[PDB]
Amino acid sequence: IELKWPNVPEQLIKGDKFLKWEEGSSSFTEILLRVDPKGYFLYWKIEGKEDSQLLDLAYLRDIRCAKYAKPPKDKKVKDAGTNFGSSNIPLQDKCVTICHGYNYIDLDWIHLVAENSSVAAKWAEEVFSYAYNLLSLNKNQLGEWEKLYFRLTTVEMEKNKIPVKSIQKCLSKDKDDRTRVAKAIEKIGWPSGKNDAIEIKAFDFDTFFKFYLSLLERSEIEGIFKELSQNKGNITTVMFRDFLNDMQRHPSLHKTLFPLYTDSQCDALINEYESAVNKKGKKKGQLTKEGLLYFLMCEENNLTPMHRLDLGANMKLSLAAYYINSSHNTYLTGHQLTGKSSVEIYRQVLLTGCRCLELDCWDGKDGEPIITHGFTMCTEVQFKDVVHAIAECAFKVSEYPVILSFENHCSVPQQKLLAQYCHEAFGELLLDNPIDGHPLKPGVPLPTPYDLRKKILIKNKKILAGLTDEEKKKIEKEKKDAGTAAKEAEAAEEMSALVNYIQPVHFTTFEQAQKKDRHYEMSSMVETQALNKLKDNPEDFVDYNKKQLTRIYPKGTRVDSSNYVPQIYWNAGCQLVALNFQCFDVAMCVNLGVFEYNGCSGYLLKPEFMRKLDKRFDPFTESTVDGVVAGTIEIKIISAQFLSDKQISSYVEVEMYGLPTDTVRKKFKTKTVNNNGMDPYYNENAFVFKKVVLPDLAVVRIIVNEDGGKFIGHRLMPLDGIKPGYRHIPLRNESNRPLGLASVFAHIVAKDYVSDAYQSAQDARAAALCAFEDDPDAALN
Ligand SMILES: [Ca+2]
Structure with a gap:
């Protein structure tokens, strides 16, 4: 790693x-x-x-x-x-x-x-x-507590002394919660007064953890400890092994790739934990209550599987084998029609890891091309400035190839400047000719992301009569939902010559694409188009996407820059599922959390059965997929820590996104705890996701809200590589950056499923798509 x-x-x-x-x-x-x-x-x-x-x-x-x-x-x-x-x-x-x-x-x-x-x-x-x-960005709660410790030890520190009011300001704004801090400090034996400071020498991190034990009432640990210890007193080396190996581990996880802990190893760890916590009383091979709670907060219990977090996926398959992080009308910071256009935004979106950007190119009135949402009250930026920005930030966070989606509406003369400006700003990074081993000829697969590192690919234009009447009308609807993207300028040679592996073509039928056999021809479909194809021939869509690329974008009627849940399109194997990054709704939250993994490169490898040429797959299946093993998931939301500096009232919610038949929203919500931002104890009976047809496509998401339904934080856990057992789950904001101390404590069950045992084809499918709506019961009408 x-x-x-x-x-x-x-x-x-x-x-x-x-x-x-x-x-x-x-x-x-x-x-x-x-x-x-x-x-x-x-x-x-x-x-x-x-x-x-x-x-x-x-x-x-x-x-x-x-x-x-x-x-x-x-x-x-x-x-x-x-x-x-x-x-x-x-x-x-x-x-x-x-x-x-x-x-x-x-x-x-x-x-x-x-x-x-x-x-x-x-x-x-x-x-x-x-x-x-990334390790800092995924640290477990003990790590965040240390983070606080370092704030107090460096920033807040005055003349080798840590003022008590600083310890207070960091943990609370409420008067009672501050007095809880006061009394907690007093238990430890530190100075307790409004105007006191603790000498640095008395202020070691180990006692600062005893401060944590004194401050919060983690009553959860009593029962956990009794479960493992039983009537035997303390948790022995042997017990703790079994704990780590049975409960804290996925039964499916491969014994030899991921070796079980050993007696000797656990001994070493118990010693570490008892040293932090016991010192005077530590015994060889014996774990106390506080030792165990320490572990559960420490890095070894971190929920994140480092193997999946690292840049560890196979990067050496055709581009069509990957989910690619995509942005829609990248340039807009706000509303679609009244919103501002930004140069800076291109920087920010790239910095998240996003790999596919959009550039609506319009003819600028002084000879110089501009970017904007055409024929709207949106503001305009300069195209020259935008590409220099792109070049600056294209490869700060990810070494892997960027795709520029161009909506071209420029004059032939201004298009020559687009081309020239691309050369100017991108120089060597611009991929203006194919690479060895991948000529633009039929039967030849796309290059691999690995082959195309630190390159920027251009998606511009290069140089069906016989239908039913309802089809014609369905197409007209697609075309207007396409907005300004419906009609584009014809390509100028100087622009067309920069396009190669990402040639957008006007998609016709699926049978058409496989007869042409041109892996380098791709299709950018407005969501309305996609849903049609998806409902009509879903299997064919999955097969299409094994060789070629599909890009998806928001219909024009989403004036607020609203987003669809991307699992709808990833389920079909669509690679470039473009979202509005300026809108932090469920869809975008999910996107950013998913693309954190794999070294946050913007690339995630599709599940194997979706890349296998010979294998048919129906994303609308409700029975299990041959070869792929279904799962049960159980989430038990127990408590939270440091949700807020004020004494809020909160509740936790748990959703799942993936296949239609595996997607659950607005079903699971904990009791509400009132007036406690510090250690609310929900103790909810577990939430069961009984049959998860296809876990590799599924993610689970923990959401925490204030009573009024205001967002506090969340966390995303893909099912592919999820760690079960008791876990601390530090919450993140919508841009998937940590809140810091704000955490949830849950028990997770992950295992294989074992059982005991009309309507029109597309009406049924359309019905399934409601699972994704913000209101699945009502939207189902
Ligand atoms: Ca557009």
């Missing part, structure tokens, strides 16, 4: 000097910029003053330097920066721009100037790597 934890060099911990300025301002400030040893926060002291400002790197979006940073325009700021550090180097080259945001749409900015270009570059490289470090 090639993933590593952050490694912050002494230079950054000790810190470097910068000047900080703000846009639309005459003045500035010199600061000492710093990172904590674990690499979780940027922090600096605003001079001769109280405290330290902080940026939580979990929400850092990008840090940039040199040519990609924003230099100051105000005269007297410019002056400062030139004479700051070394006067040799041009100001541009000392500049560092940081953008952050709890979500990637509403951003905040930080502008800085360093002493030379190396410092700039170093912070730029280092900080980024910390923010996008």
